[PDB]
Amino acid sequence: LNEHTAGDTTKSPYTIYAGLGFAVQESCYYCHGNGGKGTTEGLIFGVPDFTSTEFQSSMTDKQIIDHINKGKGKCPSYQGKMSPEMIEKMAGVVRNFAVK
Amino acid sequence: AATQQEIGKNMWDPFQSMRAVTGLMELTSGQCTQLSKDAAAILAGVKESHDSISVDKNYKVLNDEVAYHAANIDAAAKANDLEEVQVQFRRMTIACRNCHKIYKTEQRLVP
Ligand code: HEC
Numbered sequence: 001l002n003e004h005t006a007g008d009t010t011k012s013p014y015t016i017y018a019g020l021g022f023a024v025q026e027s028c029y030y031c032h033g034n035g036g037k038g039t040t041e042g043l044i045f046g047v048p049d050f051t052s053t054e055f056q057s058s059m060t061d062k063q064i065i066d067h068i069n070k071g072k073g074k075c076p077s078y079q080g081k082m083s084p085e086m087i088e089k090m091a092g093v094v095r096n097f098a099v100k
Numbered sequence: 101a102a103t104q105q106e107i108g109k110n111m112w113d114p115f116q117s118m119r120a121v122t123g124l125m126e127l128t129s130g131q132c133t134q135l136s137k138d139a140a141a142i143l144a145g146v147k148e149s150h151d152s153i154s155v156d157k158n159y160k161v162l163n164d165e166v167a168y169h170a171a172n173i174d175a176a177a178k179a180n181d182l183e184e185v186q187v188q189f190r191r192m193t194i195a196c197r198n199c200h201k202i203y204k205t206e207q208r209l210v211p
């Protein structure tokens with residue numbers, strides 16, 4: 001994956017994950033907050049634990065990119081809602097919750 | 101061995117001192133001075149969190165993006181460019197909020 005380098009927050013995937021330009025219920029952090037572990041609402045909906053080695057080993061990098069594009073269940077589809085370059089940065093954010 | 105909560109507490113007065121000045125036309129030399137001191141205090145806080153609080157790689161990059169904007173405020177203050185200080189402070193505020201919303205999602209936090 002193409003590494004996101006720290007920079008201006010208007011270009012950052014964290015600003016998108018934290019809900020810039022999205023309804024709260026369509027923002028990653030609303031379901032995948034508490035550090036990727038899942039919020040109260042996210043756990044009700046069935047989110048996996050992004051900090052978990054076992055979750056991370058269940059997906060390839062390509063599968064994470066394809067997932068963010070397609071959505072699944074209560075996880076929304078984001079194709080056309082952010083650029084392909086941002087989706088790839090976002091896949092890196094998902095990975096980085098388990099990078100210690 | 102400071103906790104993240106202690107770092108945030110120690111950053112609040114520098115942040116609120118910065119906020120109080122970004123809405124002025126002013127360029128008091130002492131106020132430009134205090135602004136650089138406030139920016140350095142923030143840089144020091146997020147460096148201490150970034151270094152001594154091992155969470156995960158995202159946590160480190162979030163700290164770095166606060167530092168990116170804090171350093172930019174420092175440079176804009178040194179260049180007597182209040183327009184840029186203002187824009188960078190807004191963007192630093194977002195950077196602070198990004199970490200709060202991602203890691204302390206269900207606690208109401210400032211700013
Ligand atoms: C609640 C409305 C959610 C929002 C907003 C986001 N996600 Fe999600 N995610 C959610 C659920 C309930 C699940 C489980 C889906 C399933 O049935 O498996 C997921 C899953 C993921 C995954 C793992 C893919 C999988 O194994 O299914 C990823 C990588 C993921 N979600 C990423 C992600 C991103 C990047 C988001 C913001 C752009 C986002 N999610 C929002 C619930 C919700």
Ligand code: HEC
Pocket residue numbers: 104105106107108109111112115142146149159160162163166192195196197199200203204209210211
């Ligand atoms: C993640 C890398 C963070 C960055 C970037 C910023 N903060 Fe933070 N902060 C973070 C956490 C996980 C917490 C909760 C601490 C806890 O109680 O568990 C906080 C807390 C604060 C607080 C509250 C302090 C208190 O009295 O309880 C403040 C006032 C605060 N943070 C300020 C702040 C500012 C101004 C930031 C940008 C300059 C900033 N934080 C960035 C994690 C992170």
Ligand SMILES: [K+]
Pocket residue numbers: 150160161164
């Ligand atoms: K870093």
